[model samples]
Target: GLTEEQRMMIRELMDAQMKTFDTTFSHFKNFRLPGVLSREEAAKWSQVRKDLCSLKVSLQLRGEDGSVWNYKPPADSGGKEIFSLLPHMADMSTYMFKGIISFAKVISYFRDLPIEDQISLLKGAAFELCQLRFNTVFNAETGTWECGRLSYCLEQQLLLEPMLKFHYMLKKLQLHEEEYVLMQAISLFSPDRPGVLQHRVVDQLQEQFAITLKSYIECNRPQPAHRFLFLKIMAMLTELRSINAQHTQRLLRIQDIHPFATPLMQELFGITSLTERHKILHRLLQE
Candidate 1:
């Protein structure tokens, strides 16, 4: 069983991230289109097609229902300019960075684990956690992640289909906020991450969160459903791992072509290739 203090720490950290998430999305809600070309200009530039096909693309909002929108870029607009979408992506990246900071604080409060162990845990788990957290904003009915006023649609069917499937699966579970935070904790304390030195200790920590998560479900959910729900949630983690792998591959490919990712973005994705930068990331966690 988790100590009350440990459970409280988890809630506090999750609350911090939730506050930031609301602020970030609300700001974007009122944002005007930033730096996108006019329809006439966009139609003239053949480069729009070439540039966008290589990256993970997001479409603009079209209607009141947020459905009845085009999956492809608007034909008259030529394509939604990738340059304009950059700011939205940057905002999303910053939101992700805040989550990392919150998660780091939770780790520090729980125990003074070795710096390397903390780094390993973060490196292994950050993307998966992000996926899980983002599901809160996912509109499974529309197959989009609704970010305030902007609706982000994945144009790549390969990713979009699986992402939609995962979102639907999670929506079916109808997890409570406490369950969401507990699931994140369970992922964070994973013992088998590549460089985790204190395997036994980490395993015990994970088991505690897992038990807490199961108890939360059992106490709240109905009898027959609750029995297999824990098993299903664990299955979702496995699905998240596969999705993370594909998402990373897409990100790396994007880097190879344009190389426009922010420093924080690169670090979070483990795309930074320098020993010096790794030290910088370590210091970031330490501070």
Candidate 2:
């Protein structure tokens, strides 16, 4: 049990952290995504509307995809992961990239760290950190990823078999977005990742968030089951490594065939084409 002082500390820390997060992410809390939101409703996201219009204009003048290195996935596969490679993917990448920045802004301490430290943290676990964002695809009740316009399931979505079990583990949890956000911050701040420069500092950062999350839950979630939620959330991180690698491999395979991936996608999946790989090798040789 936390002493009064400890409780106060947790309250103050979480309050400060959340103030930063809410201000940075107030634009996103209620903002809906494309396809999900109609033109009338989506117009509410004024900045995003402007960005999308610019994107459409750019893509228009650049001409269309039009058989230029066309790489289509198997017809048998059906899912919203990529949705329409033409339109949905372009918009999807924009929101996700913007979300990444929004998440980065949440952890003010991350910006104070060394550049190398930031890169190392991102390299080790960016996808795992964002695993909760995949919440949309996940059907917690049935433990399935329902995909596509028609709502395909299981192998139809081309989901890795293990993901079913992974979802099962998480299905019963009582999740709130605030707790999920704290979990994301916890994953990004892990000290055990190799090559981190100030691991001790990072470790303390992780603990501070963990404690703050615990206190937040105690105050908000007074049920017995909520007692174990933090433990379960942390456990999800270990399993997330394998799931993230599988997800990354799949995305990289997409990059392999479709060379026109956005820069954010390339960086997210560490994708490189044969020529790009060769250039990296040449640069390394020079070094």
**Which pairs of residues have clashing backbones in candidate 1?**
none
State how far residue 185 of model 2 sits from its true place (Å).
Answer: 0.7
Backbone steric clashes in candidate 2, count = 0
TM-scores, in order shown?
Answer: 0.73, 0.57
* Regions of candidate 1 where Cα sits further than 4 Å from its true position: 1-24, 27-34, 37-87, 107-111, 153-160, 273-276
For candidate 1, the lDDT comes to 0.65
For residues 1-287, could you state the per-residue lDDT of candidate 1 as single tens digits?
Answer: 45586566556656655654453355444333354245764543444444345444455565557564333433324334444555556556656655655565555433477777777777677777777777887776666677655567755354445655777788789887777777777777889887788899889888877887887677678888579888899898878777767766666655654465667677666765233546755766666
lDDT of 1 at 58: 55
Q: Model 2, range 160-217, lDDT digits (tens) per residue?
A: 3555555556655757766666767777788876568899999998898788778777
Model number with the top TM-score: 1
- Worst lDDT run of 10 residues, candidate 2, spans 54-63
Q: Give me candidate 2's TM-score against the actual structure.
A: 0.57
User: Cα RMSD (Å) per model?
Assistant: 6.8, 13.5
